[model samples]
Target: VEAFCATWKLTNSQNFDEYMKALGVGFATRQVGNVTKPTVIISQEGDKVVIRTLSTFKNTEISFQLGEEFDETTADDRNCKSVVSLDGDKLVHIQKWDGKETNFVREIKDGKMVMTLTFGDVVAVRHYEKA
Candidate 1:
């Protein structure tokens, strides 16, 4: 959580459509995601840590503590239990809903934050720059 202490803007994305399909997103929403590079900001407010995922079509936000589990609703309307953990220099999380698990990792590399999502074998890479 401390590693991602700034506002990051979406810069590059790979396999976005495939990843969106793995998440069971609607056709229209998938198109929107493919076209719009959203902004993500992670910060700690008071005693709570939160990540805000902002886009033109939909905004996704979640709040949780490091190494703690919390219930969150995703953009796809899934009620999930998500947990965040530290893995070396990257922050990782696994969000599970109804037996489905989506893996995510945020890493700082080359002066950018790289966020990767993996649903089974479908992996999506999204890069972000400090904003």
Candidate 2:
């Protein structure tokens, strides 16, 4: 968990919004998401990392890292906060939004990165390569 958190800290903020949109979030929601600056407060205990997602509009958090698994709920579909773990170079997030189970898989495909989100019978996919 510590390792993945460390890696996440190094990710570019500019691409984070694009990544979220790739996860199936709607246009207006993504617009709101792109404007909000989310704070990812990470607490490390041994190999575990507890990440708290904080924002003025909503508050939520999760604990996990690397191979560990955990559950999460989203209070706002706009922000779409959840618990996720790394699988190889991909990040798999098991999301609970509006009492529904949504799966988000982010990985690099064909040199262009992409994120696919599945909820109920609906699927949303987006692609991003680099800046």
Candidate 3:
């Protein structure tokens, strides 16, 4: 809990635009996300947690209790139910929408944080630094 609770700045993103495009994300929206960059903020207090994906174009924030199912909107505007939990020191997010599932795993290593997203066969890895 304490290990992963810090501000993370985006330094490297791999294949995020490609994966989002394949998921039918619009061009203008993807363009902004590709260019503006972003920061990830995670706050943990007891069992309550909040993760914020902050960018200029759109900022998405989600708060939930650990190990619980909650409603959240996907980046592509899909209605979903998500469960956020911990796997060792990594944060595991499983979101289900339209009978499909997407996984976001946030891992910390070598003094940096990396977010790995998998939507079916498409995958993107975004690396971040301590901010």
- Comparing 1 and 2 by lDDT, which wins? 1
Q: Pick out the ten consecutive residues of candidate 1 with the lowest summed lDDT.
A: 71-80
lDDT of 3 by residue, 1-131 (tens): 67778888889898867777766665677778778877888887566788888987878988888888988865676667899998888888998776778788888888788888898789999998989
Best-to-worst order by TM-score is 1, 3, 2
Which has the greatest lDDT?
Answer: 1
Model 1, 1-131: lDDT tens per residue?
56588889988888877787778776888778878878888889888778898988889887777888888877676777899987898988888888888978889997689988888888988888998
> Model 1 off-target regions past 4 Å?
none
Per-residue lDDT of 104 in model 1:
88
Pairs clashing in candidate 1?
none
lDDT per residue as tens, model 2, 1-131: 22233212122333445554555565665666655644545567665666675656656766675555444445435444355776778767776544546676666655444556666445656553333
Candidate number achieving the greatest TM-score relative to the actual structure: 1
Q: What residue pairs are clashing in model 3?
A: none
* TM-score between model 2 and native: 0.44
Per model, state how many residue pairs clash: 0, 1, 0
Model 1 TM-score, all chains together: 0.91
